[PDB]
């Protein structure tokens, strides 16, 4: 099957959520740029985001990040374009 | 088309045809093209995958890489009524079921 | 079926001609009793007879004509639990436990584990499923020498 | 009848007969049930068709 | 050819990953339409019998005259004793019978690599225990045998009389000079660029001690190469 | 034939209308493909015409499962044939029987999970020789219906196309018998007219200068299939009187 | 080099018995236990797929546009006659691309006979009828075209165009390049002044014509050799 679905499974209260996580996560994987896990040893052929979060390294909180007025995901995507060099459209 | 057993095939793929995936898999073709020296613009590119082309098989691969597909019987009774398996380009007309499935 | 039917015929035992118990697993003058007779007359080789080191050496003699059974039940509880560790729970196959397996194995296990579990018996399960050749025939229906009678 | 027509030509015993293995070689376990069966191939429909 | 793919195009790339001498998972790929079992089947059937090594033939224990029977000072059984031996692997240049004689005592685990170092015998497998001697005694001393033979030679067909023939001893053991113990092929899919129905070809390998697993293939490949080359020259 | 018949393989062709069946006793002449002359003779002994009674089989024709019926002769030359012998024989008789399958060699065992419910293994040897190969025969009629402009005209003249498209197909827009079509070729040179709407006003003044027959009509005509790729084997001839014979018929 | 008494000093004598192009037994004795059908296999998986062979690409006939035609002079349908040209057996020396003339009219059964020899071309089997032929002007010409390859083409794949170049009637027919048809092979034991538990290997190659059975059972070897190769220099 997949790898370490069953971990996966484990890291998140509710099945449906591990979905939702790994499904934004690809999101930004493709817009913004790429992830968190590279040079020693990540995936290999063409792959995918399910690796990362089987690492410790991402976070998935009800509402981590936000903006201390009005409801504004917003902010985040502020940050990541910042950051990340690579552009999509 | 036709079903039959795919014994090498696990329950994580499935033995679709390869001319079937030239037409119902145009549109991630299309975003692939440009990236390469097969096709030039996108809309010069609507005029040569839409059809029996040769040129098209290592490109498509390439996009088949991580994008599972959803299989299906008509007689649906049961959740297990439409599963989902990882594409694998398998000469024939007919289609690769897992025996277990 | 065709997967079922080549695990099931491996872990079986032959039996033909037989006169003296021999059971020499277990005991210390069976051993020793039903090893020379095996090179004899009296004693058959495709008979009830355990007697050697491990698994995988087990299967060399069995190679050169000398044993038969007690190699399957064998080759069969090491391949298996090759891919995948938990020994404990895997080593009940059968013919109607060939279903609780995949109960069983999940709830100690897990989910992942259960994913290449299914592959292992898989290739296993129709590999010896012509090695073996259960070809059926009509002289396969042995017709029960009582039936005459009944009639 | 027919048991004892499968004894005046040739070639195997009682019916099944030792092959061998295409893909080991070695010596087939137990002999098998083979022979000539007279099959039929189906038409297509246009049903059949990709 | 270079330009055409072919299996010469694309070779064999052998990834070994060898460990200690027991043991060593060998995997290939990829492999073409029907050269999946071509490969490990060739090797498996000349690892069981073609395959030359020096097993042991039988061994002789002080005071005890079975094999069944039980040995003063020793933790296990004179049975499993004897029964490990049949793992202990030994080569010998060329001798056709060679007496391995052994001497401890006192509170020491023997191991194999207490033999004394005869000029014609390598032990190559040192740490092999043999047995495990404690207090009260623990006097034992044998001395195991072993012949250069090929494939398996049953304890019954056989049987050699160093001391047997009219003094007694001695106790025959099964003689399994093939050095491979076991070998499996499993065929599973692969993942190519270009086309997806390719097979593998992973073979494990077990071995006694004589030979290591690499080395093992080699020899099993360069027999079957000799058998090649007597097609070329009629006579 | 299977190598097991009951006594009813014969009894199918013979009866039935697959087999031919002679009129009346006499002697062969010649013996070809698409007919079977019979030299009676009505007369006296010899050579020369007489009783000629010419047999037609069917060759390459549709069926209604979209297969074919064929009947290869049996008769060679010089061969007096007697009232009830068999003349060619039908889509599957082999002689006077009845063969619809064939016998290969056939070994039951599971192999490797291919055979698992109701599958089939074939050597590759199978493909290499055609012992299965089938004829099948797809019909695609093209009809041309009264245009809002005009009636609509069968011609080879097909803008919009390459010129591969029109080379197989004559000057009547009707491809030849025996072309190697494939997807994309053209079968039936139809056109149709567009519409006032469609015009430009571009195409609207040469319509009116070069002829009317200039930009008028556009590209409608029946091509293959996408997948399937074959030859054609019979082509469709017709033409109307009230639209005059032109350079079709 | 001698060695050791085992196999050196115990070569295995090929006596070979080729008759024509196809049918040729070859002998191959003494051998050791479990060594007969060994190499009777490896042989047989070579020589189906790895062995090269050039076959009949694309026919051509006189007033003949398409496959489902009909002749004024022959019962045969074309469409069964070409299927008498795919199985014909052609054996080229070294040429990329051959075109053999054929013609003949009147009453006689046209046979692989009368096709044109030529200089590189050899026919192996000329007793194969095509079709019966009778009077009323029975003239057949065929341009059988010949190429190399390796393993089964379809005619919708390679799709070649010869006299398609603005001519057009030929029509492309199955390439089946793969030589061998039939190889069996036996394991009768042999006996010997040494030992009796030998097994002789007896095998019975049988090609189509294309490739000689010398030249099948020597690249055969060669490229098998290759296989058992790979397993070598490590990474």
Same mark, same amino acid.
């Given at each position: 099957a997949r790898v370490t679905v069953q971990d996966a499974v484990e890291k998140i209260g509710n099945r449906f959520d591990l979905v939702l996580v790994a499904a934004r996560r690809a999101r930004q994987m493709q817009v913004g740029g790429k992830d968190p896990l590279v040079p020693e040893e990540n995936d290999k052929t063409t792959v995918i985001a399910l690796r990362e979060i089987e690492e410790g390294l991402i976070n998935n909180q009800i509402l981590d990040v936000r903006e201390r007025q009005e409801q504004q995901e917003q902010e985040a995507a502020e940050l990541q374009a910042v950051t990340a060099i690579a552009e999509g459209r | 088309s036709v079903i039959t057993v795919g014994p090498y095939l696990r329950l994580h793929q499935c033995g679709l045809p390869k001319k079937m995936a030239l037409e119902l898999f145009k549109p991630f073709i299309y975003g692939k093209l440009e990236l390469r020296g097969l096709a030039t613009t996108i809309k010069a590119a609507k005029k040569m995958? %839409?059809?029996? %082309?040769?040129?098209?098989w290592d490109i498509l691969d390439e996009v088949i890489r991580e994008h599972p597909v959803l299989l299906n019987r008509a007689p649906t009774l049961h959740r297990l009524g439409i599963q989902a398996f990882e594409p694998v380009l398998i000469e024939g007309k007919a289609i690769q079921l897992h025996p277990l499935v | 079926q065709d997967v079922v039917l080549g695990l099931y015929y491996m872990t079986r035992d032959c039996v033909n001609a037989k006169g003296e118990g021999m059971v020499l697993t277990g005991p210390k003058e069976a051993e020793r009793l039903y090893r020379s007779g095996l090179a004899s007359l009296h004693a058959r080789v495709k008979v009830r007879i355990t007697e050697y080191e491990k698994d995988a050496n087990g299967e060399l003699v069995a190679k050169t004509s000398l044993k038969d059974t007690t190699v399957g039940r064998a080759i069969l509880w090491m391949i298996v639990p090759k891919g995948l560790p938990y020994s404990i729970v895997n080593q009940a196959l059968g013919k109607k436990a060939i279903s609780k397996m995949l109960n069983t194995c999940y709830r100690i296990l897990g989910l992942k584990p259960t994913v290449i579990f299914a592959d292992q018996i898989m290739y296993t399960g129709f590999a010896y499923a012509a090695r073996s050749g259960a070809s059926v025939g009509i002289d396969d229906m042995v017709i029960p020498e009582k039936k005459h009678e009944i009639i | 009848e027919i048991k004892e027509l499968l004894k005046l030509g040739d070639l195997p015993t009682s019916g099944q007969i030792r092959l061998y293995d295409?893909?080991?070689?070695?010596?087939?376990?137990r002999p098998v049930t083979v022979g000539y069966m007279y099959m039929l191939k189906l038409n297509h429909l246009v049903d059949d068709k990709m | 050819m270079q330009g055409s793919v072919t299996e010469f195009l694309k070779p064999r790339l052998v990834d070994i990953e060898q460990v200690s001498s027991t043991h060593a998972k060998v995997t290939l790929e990829p492999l073409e339409r029907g050269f999946g079992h071509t490969l490990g089947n060739a090797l498996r059937r000349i690892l069981l019998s073609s395959m030359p090594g020096c097993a042991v033939t039988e061994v002789e224990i002080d005071g005890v005259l079975h094999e069944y029977s039980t040995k003063e000072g020793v933790q296990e059984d004179i049975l499993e004793i004897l029964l490990n031996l049949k793992g202990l692997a030994v080569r010998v240049q060329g001798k056709d019978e060679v007496i391995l004689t052994l001497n401890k005592s006192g509170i020491g685990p023997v191991t194999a690599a207490d033999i004394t170092h005869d000029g014609d015998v390598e032990i190559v497998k040192p740490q092999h225990v043999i047995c495990h001697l404690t207090d009260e005694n623990a006097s034992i001393s044998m001395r195991i045998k072993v012949q250069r033979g090929r494939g398996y030679v049953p304890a019954s067909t056989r049987i050699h009389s160093e #001391?047997? #023939?009219?003094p007694i001893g001695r106790l025959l053991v099964d003689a399994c000079y093939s050095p491979v113990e076991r070998i499996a092929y499993n065929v599973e899919a692969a993942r190519v660029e270009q086309r997806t129905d390719l097979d593998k070809l992973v073979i494990e390998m077990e071995t006694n001690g004589t030979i290591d697993p690499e080395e093992a293939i080699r020899r099993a490949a360069t027999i079957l190469a000799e058998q090649l080359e007597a097609f070329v020259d009629l006579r | 034939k299977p190598l097991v018949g009951t006594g009813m393989e014969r009894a199918v062709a013979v009866d039935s209308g697959v087999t031919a069946v002679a009129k009346r006793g006499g002697v062969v002449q010649y013996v070809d493909a698409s007919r079977i002359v019979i030299k009676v003779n009505e007369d006296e002994m010899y050579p020369g015409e007489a009783g000629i009674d010419i047999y037609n089989l069917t060759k390459y024709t549709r069926s209604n499962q979209n297969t074919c019926i064929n009947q290869m002769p049996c008769v060679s030359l010089g061969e007096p044939v007697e009232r009830g012998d068999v003349l060619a024989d039908g889509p599957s008789t082999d002689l006077g029987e009845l063969a619809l399958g064939q016998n290969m060699r056939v070994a039951f065992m599971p192999w490797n999970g291919y055979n698992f419910e109701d599958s089939i293994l074939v050597s590759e040897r199978v493909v290499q020789e055609?012992?299965?190969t089938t004829i099948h025969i797809q019909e695609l009629a093209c009809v041309s219906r009264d245009t809002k402009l005009g009636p609509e005209e069968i011609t080879a003249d097909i803008p919009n196309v390459g010129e591969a498209a029109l080379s197989k197909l004559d000057e009547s827009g009707i491809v030849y018998i025996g072309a190697e079509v494939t997807g994309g070729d053209i079968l039936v040179g139809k056109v149709t007219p567009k519409g006032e709407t469609q015009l430009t006003p571009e195409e609207k003044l040469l319509r009116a200068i070069f002829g009317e027959k200039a930009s008028d009509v556009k590209d409608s005509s029946l091509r293959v299939p996408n997948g399937v790729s074959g030859t054609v084997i019979d082509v469709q001839v017709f033409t109307r009187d009230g639209v005059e014979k032109d350079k079709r018929a």
């Open positions: - | 995958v %839409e059809r029996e %082309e040769a040129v098209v | - | 295409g893909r080991t070689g070695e010596q087939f376990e | #001391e047997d #023939e009219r | 055609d012992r299965f």
